[PDB]
Design a protein around this ligand. Structure first.
Ligand SMILES: Fc1ccc(-c2[nH]nc3c2CN(c2ccccn2)CC3)cc1
Ligand code: NI
Length: 338
């Protein structure tokens, strides 16, 4: 087995010629040569078994990505783990290798309005599918948006993905309702993140680069202005609400002042996605039908999921040893002699 950044990547003999791509909370990503398909692939090594929360994330991502089938959503082509449950310490998820991500592209490249439009379209096309299956991503950011050599875009990293239930509920792309209204299962949280990504594509810099929770709220309020009484007359964390009420008045900054060169239709859609109140924020289908996306909007070519996604078990209640058995079972079909 090859060693990448001092750590073991036990993916041979099929996968070789490893090269580091990145790491984070998702684990470590390498590219490798697949000697069967005769192409380079992406391999993600995860070590989640010591924590129940990491076990839940691993299982959710495997189940969702193996069910989903959409051009703007990354799939899972293969999964490597040990022959026995006692020996299984790591899981390797094998996926299509892309050319870059939007984080790397935004650090080196200025995008034309046609490419901002096209990328925003593909993000929403993928999000329409996810939301149609009653699922929300919850962690949309530029490093989770993959691009190939021909500008085809794929959303990845479904570790924090959950089945939506809206009726009752860095940090740079996090909706205010996550930090205030204790919401984590409303599709609107993904729209806010897409709004943050759109703003970043327009200027090559994060719109709300908060260093911490309070600083994040100050950045949002610095553009949107003070929340209205209605924006605050909802379910909100007492500490958060008292903090907001203790602050001096902040004026709203018009979108054209922050992005003076942006297409006015792009700013109009940006205004609708970056709305403080989640109940007043534009939804995915309405965002696809906005005049900014007219050149690419094609409802006859925007697949939706066959049925809502559902977990057969209460994953949050299961001890990590039980989750490990379900992961072992879910990954059995990728092993020899199945
Ligand atoms: F410059 C790059 C070139 C290729 C990729 C790529 N291609 N295919 C994948 C990835 C990254 N990736 C990720 C990234 C963050 C979280 C989970 N998974 C796994 C799937 C990324 C950057
Ligand atoms: Ni409720």
């Amino acid at each position: 087995p090859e060693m990448v950044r001092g750590q073991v990547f036990d993916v041979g003999p099929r996968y070789t010629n490893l090269s580091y791509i990145g790491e984070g909370a998702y684990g470590m990503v390498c590219s490798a040569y697949d000697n069967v398909n005769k192409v380079r692939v992406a391999i993600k090594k995860i070590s989640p078994f010591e924590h129940q929360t990491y076990c839940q994330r691993t299982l959710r991502e495997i189940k969702i990505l193996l069910r989903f089938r959409h051009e703007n959503i990354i799939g899972i082509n293969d999964i490597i783990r040990a022959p026995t449950i006692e020996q299984m310490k790591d899981v390797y998820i094998v996926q299509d290798l892309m050319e870059t991500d939007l984080y790397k592209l935004l650090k080196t490249q200025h995008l034309s309005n046609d490419h901002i439009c096209y990328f925003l379209y593909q993000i929403l096309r993928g999000l329409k599918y996810i939301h149609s299956a009653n699922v929300l991503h919850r962690d949309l950011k530029p490093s989770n948006l993959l691009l190939n050599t021909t500008c085809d875009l794929k959303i990845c990293d479904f570790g924090l993905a959950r089945v939506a239930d809206p009726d009752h509920d860095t940090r740079w792309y996090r909706a205010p309702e996550i930090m205030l209204n204790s919401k984590g299962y409303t599709k609107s949280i993904d729209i806010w993140s897409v709004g943050c990504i759109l703003a970043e594509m327009l200027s090559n810099r994060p719109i709300f680069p908060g260093k911490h929770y309070l600083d994040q709220l100050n950045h949002i309020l610095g553009i949107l202005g003070s929340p209205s009484q209605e924006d605050l007359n909802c379910i909100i964390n007492l500490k958060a609400r008292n903090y907001l009420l203790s602050l001096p008045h902040k004026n709203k900054v018009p979108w054209n002042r922050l992005f003076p060169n942006a297409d006015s239709k792009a700013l109009d859609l940006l205004d609708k996605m970056l709305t403080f109140n989640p109940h007043k924020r534009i939804e995915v289908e309405q965002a696809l039908a906005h005049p900014y996306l007219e050149q690419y909007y094609d409802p006859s070519d925007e697949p939706i999921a066959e049925a809502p996604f559902k977990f057969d078990m209460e994953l949050d209640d299961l001890p990590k040893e039980k989750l490990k058995e379900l992961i072992f079972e879910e990954t059995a079909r990728f092993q020899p002699g199945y």
